[PDB]
Amino acid sequence: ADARSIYVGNVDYGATAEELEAHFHGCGSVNRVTILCDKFSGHPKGFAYIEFSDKESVRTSLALDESLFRGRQIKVIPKR
Amino acid sequence: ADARSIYVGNVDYGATAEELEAHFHGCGSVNRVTILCDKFSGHPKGFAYIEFSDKESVRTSLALDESLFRGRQIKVIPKR
């Protein structure tokens, strides 16, 4: 479950689960999206977890590290 | 933290953390918003945990149970 998950660093408070999924839909089936935010205005402060169905999708998703999501470049590293 | 959080059922999958915090701003100062969503087809719902700065804010927030948020009546209870 941790093995099938990525950390997604640098995620604002306007990130919706709908959108984050859609940004990784291309890498494989997604089971869950978890967004965590510690600021809700001003400069943002938050990450998310994407838990894919299959493990393969984790190696695949690393191809989006440094990609532009919602106008900001995200950090994609596996949860394990 | 769990003594300071509420569980929020029926959260539309288009919800943002800023929108949630705005909805709950009246009840007290919020540390952390966590949005969890498991389905990404149609107009599904997920849920959220709202962590406050203060234990008293939880009881206050319980008033917003059944209140309307993005076209759904939300369920507000203290975190199990």
Curated annotation (Swiss-Prot), chains A, B:
Q: Which residues carry this modification: Asymmetric dimethylarginine?
A: R70
UniProt disease annotation:
Oculopharyngeal muscular dystrophy 1: An autosomal dominant, late-onset, slowly progressive myopathy characterized by eyelid ptosis, dysphagia and, sometimes by other cranial and limb-muscle involvement.
Question: In the UniProt record, what gene is named as encoding this protein?
Answer: PABPN1
- Top-level division of the source organism's lineage: Eukaryota
Q: Which residues carry this modification: Phosphoserine?
A: S67
Q: What tissues is it present in?
A: Ubiquitous.
Q: Where in the cell is it found?
A: Nucleus; Cytoplasm; Nucleus speckle
The scientific name of the source species is: Homo sapiens (Human)
Any remaining note in the record?
Answer: The association of the expanded polyalanine mutations together with the capability to oligomerize may induce intranuclear inclusions and cell death. Expanded polyalanine mutations may either result from unequal crossing over during germ cell homologous recombination or from DNA slippage. The pathogenic mechanisms mediated by polyalanine expansion mutations may be either a general disruption of cellular RNA metabolism due to the trapping by the inclusions of PABPN1, mRNAs and/or nuclear proteins, resulting in the induction of cell death; or may change the normal muscle cell differentiation.
Question: Transmembrane segments in this chain: where?
Answer: none
Record domain RRM: where: 4-80
Quote the function comment for this protein: Involved in the 3'-end formation of mRNA precursors (pre-mRNA) by the addition of a poly(A) tail of 200-250 nt to the upstream cleavage product. Stimulates poly(A) polymerase (PAPOLA) conferring processivity on the poly(A) tail elongation reaction and also controls the poly(A) tail length. Increases the affinity of poly(A) polymerase for RNA. Is also present at various stages of mRNA metabolism including nucleocytoplasmic trafficking and nonsense-mediated decay (NMD) of mRNA.
Kindly state the subunit structure of this protein: May interact with SETX. Monomer and homooligomer. Binds RNA as a monomer and oligomerizes when bound to poly(A). Interacts with PAPOLA, but only in presence of oligo(A) RNA. Interacts with transportin. Identified in a IGF2BP1-dependent mRNP granule complex containing untranslated mRNAs. Association in a ternary complex with CPSF4 and influenza A virus NS1 blocks pre-mRNAs processing, thereby preventing nuclear export of host cell mRNAs. Associates in a single complex with SKIP and MYOD1 and interacts with SKIP in differentiated myocytes. Interacts with NUDT21/CPSF5.
Q: Which portion of the entire protein is included?
A: 169 to 248 of 306
Q: How is it modified after translation?
A: Arginine dimethylation is asymmetric and involves PRMT1 and PRMT3. It does not influence the RNA binding properties.
At which residues is Omega-N-methylarginine found?
Answer: R70
Record comment regarding domains: The RRM domain is essential for specific adenine bases recognition in the poly(A) tail but not sufficient for poly(A) binding.
Q: What is this protein called?
A: Polyadenylate-binding protein 2
